[model samples]
Target chain A: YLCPNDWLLNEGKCYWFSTSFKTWKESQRDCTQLQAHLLVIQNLDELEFIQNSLKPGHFGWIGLYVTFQGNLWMWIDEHFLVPELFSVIGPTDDRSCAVITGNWVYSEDCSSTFKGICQRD
Target chain B: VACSGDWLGVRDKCFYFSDDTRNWTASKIFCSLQKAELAQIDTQEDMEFLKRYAGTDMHWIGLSRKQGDSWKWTNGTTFNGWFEIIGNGSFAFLSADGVHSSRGFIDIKWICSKPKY
Candidate 1:
């Protein structure tokens, strides 16, 4: 049976981080409640990498979202947008949702719940 | 065999357990032994829906990087939950804190699932 590239490798899977300028702890807890852990990047390839040839630019959240107004998204641990991915897509600028796409896409919505990838086998 | 005994909350035919921390593998086993799969998210909105319940501690979701990079369920279902990837851990014990520190080691032995109450 064929599966997505994220599911093919012993160490590769497509992942996404959902955030809205909310507190860091809130985002973490949110994912955890869903049976997901904070984003863990293993290597450079995993960081500036891509799951499909379909996408060109590499962009996505790494377990960091901030919510100041109501909630916000970020790349680094501290509520600041990682600035790396946002080089392409502009931050929501207010406080809301933040989505990381494989092709340098960023969306911010405070009440947004994004997806992520985890490994076990 | 006696899985449904654990699930204590049901809403709209879908049951939801209290938010607790468990790794992906642990969540799968817990759900399997309990007779359920970790939560399999369908859409980005679903991810948001789950956010309302993000536990203070990490809970197990249907998403996992184990068994190869693909997102599979304890029941062998497939889908990309679509959030950035976070690899698996806690196959031993729950960490004293949610963040990974070389200090508190969770042997990564356990997981969480919606027990069929």
Candidate 2:
């Protein structure tokens, strides 16, 4: 009848924030396991909305990943990261994963652990 | 998997539409020929699903009743008017055009359905 338990509906989209830490890969698997995926902040307000709900002192995994094809900060859904959105951390490294310090996205080691957000239509 | 030779599979069931015209009773027999039944609608979800398939051809469904009697479905499920059944008659057919009821003996297209494995 509505978004599942623990899922939050905002505008037309639904989101689920992880209550515990996970490696970005582990976080991604958790969301897919739960009918979701990591956060993809495509808008300013959406990014702000997620940051407001997050725990203090804890980083939240986002859907941004640098393509092995190159440093194209490709969002998981395959859109190129917007030049205006936020710059990738280090701009070049195996720092291929991102999180919502956006307060600005800080691309980080793909295997690093953090709490994450999941989203669905 | 593939549905009955072009019968479309949606979620829990596979459905097929008849190109040949059949009276209501003949339609029921045709569905049973495939170990299925005349289509019965359950919700806006089901009503919307069939509209895409039957948009070009109004197909007979499982809803029907005897003259001056209560309406029912072919599966023995009692009908409670999940969607509007238009005008008068004993059997109903569906399309984006509308849900129209008419004499069951009349020849028209029918949709058949069965649980999908």
Candidate 3:
């Protein structure tokens, strides 16, 4: 499918990187409003594309999170997280959401406000 | 045989023994591109099957441990001590002799495997 306006195309998928502030849940809601889901990086190619798209010091939510505050992560759209793909940081008994930056993904409080990345078929 | 490329089909699993050498990370990436991972030995039976396949050359397998952590497969399964692992290292390999180890990022041959699924 063709990418919508402001959505970048790569490897037959469309991605939208947000600029405004929002928590994980609200960012997810915004994605659904645009008929897309929060970003689920399928492989390293998509990961490289994503990292390149962001400006320096860019920190944003990806579709990965766990209610158990552990590495038992799953993508928002029911995809499995490839632990070998990225480094992880942080933890807590409360829910930990994934925020991507550089070669690492920091586990943040789900309520922490940050821009998010969205992916569409 | 339910295998891809030149991978060997044994039972329901498909394995590729690379003749070329590379480091562990790049080896993982190449196998990932082929929709597989470094071979994970699940049991004594699995080890036996892999030994003859690897013959004499010791190639990298999907087993690794971070510093002091227990060994884990690429699929996140822990090594159950099915076979004796000689010496100490982060990345492991198999051969006709037995299990061996290598420091990750060191250039070496490796094996990749996938299931019929």
Candidate 4:
């Protein structure tokens, strides 16, 4: 018996959430070992799927984050998160990195460790 | 707090290339070995995040038009994003030093590699 609400089970693939925390450098291989690419936000639907499935205040590693650059969000999937979807309050010339908060606020970077979510075949 | 559109390292995970240098193909190979493919982006939210964080280290994406004007990933994914201006010239033509030198970038070549964790 599988969890009916599990999005990871769709299309006969298995998706996982990882507790083994690492930098984006370390986690990429972790996702790979499971035979999955880093998470790709396929559409708004997937975004909602993840949001709904998540627990309140439960933080997890997502593929999107800013590093030294202070103006663009790159998805592990290789597509650019255009200006339209950016947080209107962001793009501060002074800020150099970013992260997503529990409330779904894509905000500035905070030094915090959490689990990660992954999809596998 | 880091600013907008930057590459955010989650706790510790981050994308690293060799010597801060890699062509699109090489970068994809590098990322793939880790079980991750090229970084995939598809929203305004993601773009804003990367732009704020990428810094001087411009990433090599999965897009390529070196063989033709039509862009697709080495994984064979098609062009589907917000930067329509560049068409399909991101990987080979959009690196730190290998960016488009002229209006025509057909002369450039693609160098492939593995994504290092």
- For candidate 3, write residues A1-121 as lDDT tens digits: 6876788888778888876657788899998999988888888888888876654334577888885745577887686677678755655335667777544566666665556788888
Model 1 misplaced stretches (Cα beyond 4 Å): A1-121, B1-13, B16-23, B43-45, B67-69, B86-117
Tens-place lDDT digits, model 1, residues B1-117: 233454433332233453333334544666666466665544455444344444322344554434345544555666444544322321111211222111011112233444333
Per model, state how many residue pairs clash: 69, 0, 0, 77
> What lDDT score is found at residue A26 in candidate 4?
48
Worst 10 residues of 2 chain A by lDDT: A51-60
After superposition of all CA atoms, the RMSD between model 4 and the true structure is 19.3
- The deviation in Å at residue B25 for candidate 2 is 0.8
Residues A5-120, model 2: lDDT tens digits: 87877666788877655667899999899778888876877877776664322346788887776657777887887877667544455445776642445555565444678887
True contacts kept of each: 0.00, 0.00, 0.00, 0.00
Q: Measured by TM-score, how close is model 2 to the native structure?
A: 0.47
Best-performing candidate as measured by lDDT: 3
For each candidate, give its TM-score against the true structure. 0.32, 0.47, 0.47, 0.39
Specify the poorest-scoring 10-residue window by lDDT in model 3 chain B. Answer: B99-108
Off by over 4 Å in 3: A69-71, B1-117
Relative to the real complex, the DockQ score for model 2 comes to: 0.01
| CA lDDT of each prediction against the hidden true structure | 0.39, 0.70, 0.72, 0.44
Residue A1 lDDT, candidate 1, scale 0-100 = 35
